Amino acid sequence: KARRRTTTQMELLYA
Amino acid sequence: RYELSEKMLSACNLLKYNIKDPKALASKDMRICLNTLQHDWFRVSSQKSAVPAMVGDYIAAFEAVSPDVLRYIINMADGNGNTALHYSVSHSNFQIVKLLLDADVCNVDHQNKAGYTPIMLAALAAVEAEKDMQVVEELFSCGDVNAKASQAGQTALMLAVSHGRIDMVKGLLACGADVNIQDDEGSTALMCASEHGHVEIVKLLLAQPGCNGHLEDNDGSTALSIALEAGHKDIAVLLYAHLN
């Protein structure tokens, strides 16, 4: 689930 | 004071004469012009080492060509769908973020190819001084704090909560974030906090007028059931207390 996953700064910036 | 190169000033003037003619603007030859603009603008604005006085000087020079040329260039997106606002937020270059906001023509809600807006990027950006947080809150007030990312429909508030960023959560709530928005899977910020065991963030969310602890995700899980299952009995007791 998205609510459990970690998102990094690089993942926000680049696809 | 920094000045545009001859070639850059030239490209700006060409844009000025063409900016109102859509089909010229899309012409293949005009693209070489637009590529010059994009290249030089991202060179000066978007590296971690960008110099705020240089960005300021460039902004002033674009506006002197035309306010419409300023609006066009500072809203350009690169091949990643990123604007200078995306890069300057990601780099925590908040003096440059402030210059872009103050130009008063930024589209702050632009999603990059990854699917995120600059407000979402800010939710994970380093903020080392309370004065930088003032710029972050100005950004939050210039765009849609409730926007949902193309990836999973998450909000900035969910992102901040998932990283345990109490500072950002307080900022987003103060700037009008809706605590009850659900992502594509039906998860709320409160559910995100329950997964991670972030006690103080749970209290902050529960303290918001209209916080709805009863919401279920698409499988019928609640913040309370999530908390117990993730082994965070203290949050579960907190949730129970608030719900009853």
UniProtKB/Swiss-Prot annotation, chain A:
Tissue: Widely expressed, with highest expression in brain.
Region span, Interaction with KANK1 and KANK2: 1-15
Domain of life: Eukaryota
Subcellular location: Cytoplasm, Cytoskeleton; Cytoplasm, Cell cortex; Cell projection, Dendrite; Cell projection, Axon
Outcome after substituting L12Q: Decreases the binding affinity for KANK1 by 20-fold
Function field: Processive microtubule plus-end directed motor protein involved in neuronal axon guidance. Is recruited by KANK1 to cortical microtubule stabilizing complexes (CMSCs) at focal adhesions (FAs) rims where it promotes microtubule capture and stability. Controls microtubule polymerization rate at axonal growth cones and suppresses microtubule growth without inducing microtubule disassembly once it reaches the cell cortex.
Domain remark in the UniProt entry: The coiled coil region interacts with the kinesin motor domain leading to autoinhibition of the motor.
Subunit and partners: Part of a cortical microtubule stabilization complex (CMSC) composed of KANK1, PPFIA1, PPFIBP1, ERC1/ELKS, PHLDB2/LL5beta, CLASPs, KIF21A and possibly additional interactors; within CMSCs KANK1 and PHLDB2/LL5beta seem to be the core components for recruiting microtubule-binding proteins KIF21A and CLASPs, whereas PPFIA1, PPFIBP1 and ERC1/ELKS serve as scaffolds for protein clustering. Interacts (via residues 1142-1169) with KANK1 (via ankyrin repeats 1-5) and KANK2 (via ankyrin repeats 1-5).
Family in the record: Belongs to the TRAFAC class myosin-kinesin ATPase superfamily. Kinesin family.
Protein name, UniProt field: Kinesin-like protein KIF21A
Boundaries of the shown chain within the full protein: 1154 to 1168 of 1672
Swiss-Prot record, chain B:
Region (Interaction with KIF21A), start-end ranges: 1-244
Entry superkingdom: Eukaryota
Effect of S90F: Does not affect KIF21A binding
Residue stretches of each ANK repeat: 28-65, 80-110, 114-147, 152-181, 185-217, 219-244
Intracellular or extracellular location(s): Cytoplasm, Cell cortex; Cell projection, Ruffle membrane; Cytoplasm; Nucleus
Biological function: Adapter protein that links structural and signaling protein complexes positioned to guide microtubule and actin cytoskeleton dynamics during cell morphogenesis. At focal adhesions (FAs) rims, organizes cortical microtubule stabilizing complexes (CMSCs) and directly interacts with major FA component TLN1, forming macromolecular assemblies positioned to control microtubule-actin crosstalk at the cell edge. Recruits KIF21A in CMSCs at axonal growth cones and regulates axon guidance by suppressing microtubule growth without inducing microtubule disassembly once it reaches the cell cortex.
Complexes and interactors: Part of a cortical microtubule stabilization complex (CMSC) composed of KANK1, PPFIA1, PPFIBP1, ERC1/ELKS, PHLDB2/LL5beta, CLASPs, KIF21A and possibly additional interactors; within CMSCs KANK1 and PHLDB2/LL5beta appear to be the core components for targeting of microtubule-binding proteins KIF21A and CLASPs, whereas PPFIA1, PPFIBP1 and ERC1/ELKS serve as scaffolds for protein clustering. Interacts (via KN motif) with TLN1 (via R7 domain); this mediates CMSC clustering around focal adhesions. Interacts (via CC1 domain, residues 244-339) with PPFIBP1.
Protein name: KN motif and ankyrin repeat domains 1
Gene: Kank1
